[PDB]
Amino acid sequence: AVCPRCEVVMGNLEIVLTGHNADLSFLQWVREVTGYVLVAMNEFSTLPLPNLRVVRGTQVYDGKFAIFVMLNYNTNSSHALRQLRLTQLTEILSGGVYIEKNDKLCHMDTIDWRDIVRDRDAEIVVKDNGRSCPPCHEVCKGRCWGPGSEDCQTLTKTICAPQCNGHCFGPNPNQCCHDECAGGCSGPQDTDCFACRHFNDSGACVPRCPQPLVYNKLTFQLEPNPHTKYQYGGVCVASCPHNFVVDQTSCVRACPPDKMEVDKNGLKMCEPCGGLCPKACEGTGSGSRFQTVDSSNIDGFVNCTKILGNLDFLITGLNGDPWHKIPALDPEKLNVFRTVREITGYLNIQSWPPHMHNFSVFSNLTTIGGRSLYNRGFSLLIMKNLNVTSLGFRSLKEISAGRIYISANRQLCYHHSLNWTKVLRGPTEERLDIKHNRPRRDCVAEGKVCDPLCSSGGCWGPGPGQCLSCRNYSRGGVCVTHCNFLNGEPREFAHEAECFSCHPECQPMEGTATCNGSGSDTCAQCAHFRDGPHCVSSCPHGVLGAKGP
Ligand SMILES: *[C@@H]1O[C@H](CO)[C@@H](O[C@@H]2O[C@H](CO)[C@@H](O)[C@H](O)[C@H]2NC(C)=O)[C@H](O)[C@H]1NC(C)=O
Ligand SMILES: *C1O[C@H](CO)[C@@H](O)[C@H](O)[C@H]1NC(C)=O
Ligand SMILES: *[C@@H]1O[C@H](CO)[C@@H](O)[C@H](O)[C@H]1NC(C)=O
Ligand SMILES: *[C@@H]1O[C@H](CO)[C@@H](O)[C@H](O)[C@H]1NC(C)=O
Ligand SMILES: *[C@@H]1O[C@H](CO)[C@@H](O)[C@H](O)[C@H]1NC(C)=O
Ligand SMILES: *[C@@H]1O[C@H](CO)[C@@H](O)[C@H](O)[C@H]1NC(C)=O
Ligand SMILES: *[C@@H]1O[C@H](CO)[C@@H](O)[C@H](O)[C@H]1NC(C)=O
Ligand SMILES: *[C@H]1O[C@H](CO)[C@@H](O)[C@H](O)[C@H]1NC(C)=O
């Protein structure tokens, strides 16, 4: 029904430059136009809008017209606009009317425009049109869109009683329009409006569409509602246009600058990403214009989460190259890679800024694909970085294919203990080229080994946040001796050895578990009020759900 057998025209209805024998039939079923109607520079004889009841003018041509009909005739021929067939035009919600310079347009001087127009200071300008026009049928009582007995304008407005604020269907104080009508009505009900103030659900003029969740007397919380509907400005719809997507409750063209299209259980929605929304970008190397990230490149990675391909950090890439004039990298511009979670191909690091003792810049890198390899098949290559003390790939859980090369980093520690077979899946056999970094014996004696809270896997550097996996528990990627099970400011629970807080308002219990899960329906005791299995703050001040709040 809605559209940009169309019934609602979401936006403006612009007809301009149309030929004498053009099929305007698609419009026949059109009931409402949300913006304005513009009719200019055409040669057809009649504008067929049998069903047009309402023009809204929520956008308005020239600054004050919801209707604009101008210059619809051509001198060289007898083709021109004879009649505006608006036989059902009941109301215009904002904006005046401009009908001028239509040399053959008849009758427009007979219509009580001030009857159709809600705006009591809208500009009405009908003039210089048809000149030898026929009279209205005697039945039209002076007011017509046509020469025939069925082309009448019938009046709509009715002087009205105090109680009604301009909104009524007869002169009585008992004949008020329902609060939800934009303009006039033909009864006191939701379903009797000429046009809705807010939304239209399948007939009823309603202040919101049927909501995405509904209260349950049986569970005492909210739940998914099989009667739910989404907004398309005016029309409450069951599913969105073949083009569109759902953002919370509305239908939109596309997600806001903070969300991604997540496809789930037969509905495409717009969910918040949190930090940043995935952005794929081209890697360096074999298949690119760049064999190294460098000064002329590094901007092209901002806000990047997935690298399609590889990353290559070569010596001229860092120190510049005086001959061809690509300046040295500013070291702190490397923070740009903090946002990277995946590398599709390989990571190759052969030069690193001297004052940076680790690759913490990739502290969020999760997955090295090895979808392309680098020398004799290395998915990871860290070579001759003389100032690097620790890898620091705190997030890296997967290298999907290829071999590893970590050599000649004279000062590199913490890497001896690492179980690569947890990180690098596939055969282990022969995939490890690791040599001539800081000798283990020396590391052990400067105390540069895994934190005791680390499991026998190993770490990516010093401290409890560099572990591959914890001995006991973890909280936000940092190994801890204990969760706040029976003390500690934000009280907590464990699931598969991590700590999450209790539902924001359980009562914190001294020396006993506060909760065994997230949610109100799992606290040991509520610090506020309770409603069935659930701890809640504000009591349900209005049962917004099943049927009526
Ligand atoms: C990884 O290396 C960074 C950068 O070199 C280290 O950060 C420095 O740490 C020392 C403490 O030992 C501070 O006094 C420096 O001022 C820090 N420098 C800057 C600017 O970051 C960090 O210690 C290392 N972190 C890891 C992974 O252990
Ligand atoms: C490394 O872990 C894997 C599986 O997680 C296991 O097969 C292997 O025994 C570990 N290596 C050591 C140090 O035993
Ligand atoms: C509201 O929706 C129904 C949907 O079929 C439609 O027929 C009705 O005319 C509309 N009423 C308005 C625009 O107020
Ligand atoms: C990256 O995202 C940040 C944080 O939302 C924002 O300030 C910035 O506009 C983005 N930059 C680019 C080029 O995407
Ligand atoms: C690089 O490593 C060497 C070798 O120990 C050290 O002397 C030098 O100061 C380091 N440079 C910086 C600034 O880290
Ligand atoms: C953590 O794990 C170790 C090794 O199994 C254990 O002996 C130690 O008591 C644990 N510490 C805590 C606080 O649970
Ligand atoms: C807490 O969680 C576990 C498993 O999810 C369950 O054994 C236990 O019964 C729960 N506690 C409550 C409130 O019943
Ligand atoms: C990684 O942590 C840093 C912290 O500043 C942040 O910039 C980035 O969005 C995080 N990304 C992931 C995958 O958590």
From Swiss-Prot:
Epithelial tissues and brain. Disulfide bonds join C3-C6, C106-C133, C136-C144, C140-C152, C160-C168, C164-C176, C177-C185, C181-C193, C196-C205, C209-C236, C240-C251, C255-C270, C273-C277, C450-C459, C454-C467, C470-C479, C483-C499, C502-C515, C506-C523, C526-C535. Glycans are attached at N76, N200, N303, N358, N364, N387, N419, N472, N516. Autophosphorylated. Ligand-binding increases phosphorylation on tyrosine residues and promotes its association with the p85 subunit of phosphatidylinositol 3-kinase. Residues 1-549 are extracellular. It is linked to Lethal congenital contracture syndrome 2: A form of lethal congenital contracture syndrome, an autosomal recessive disorder characterized by degeneration of anterior horn neurons, extreme skeletal muscle atrophy, and congenital non-progressive joint contractures (arthrogryposis). The contractures can involve the upper or lower limbs and/or the vertebral column, leading to various degrees of flexion or extension limitations evident at birth. Erythroleukemia, familial: An autosomal dominant myeloproliferative disorder characterized by neoplastic proliferation of erythroblastic and myeloblastic elements with atypical erythroblasts and myeloblasts in the peripheral blood. Disease penetrance is incomplete. Belongs to the protein kinase superfamily. Tyr protein kinase family. EGF receptor subfamily. The cytoplasmic part of the receptor may interact with the SH2 or SH3 domains of many signal-transducing proteins. Monomer and homodimer. Heterodimer with each of the other ERBB receptors (Potential). Interacts with CSPG5. Interacts with GRB7. Interacts with MUC1. Interacts with MYOC. Interacts with isoform 2 of PA2G4. Found in a ternary complex with NRG1 and ITGAV:ITGB3 or ITGA6:ITGB4. Tyrosine-protein kinase that plays an essential role as cell surface receptor for neuregulins. Binds to neuregulin-1 (NRG1) and is activated by it; ligand-binding increases phosphorylation on tyrosine residues and promotes its association with the p85 subunit of phosphatidylinositol 3-kinase. May also be activated by CSPG5. Involved in the regulation of myeloid cell differentiation. This is Receptor tyrosine-protein kinase erbB-3. It comes from Homo sapiens (Human).
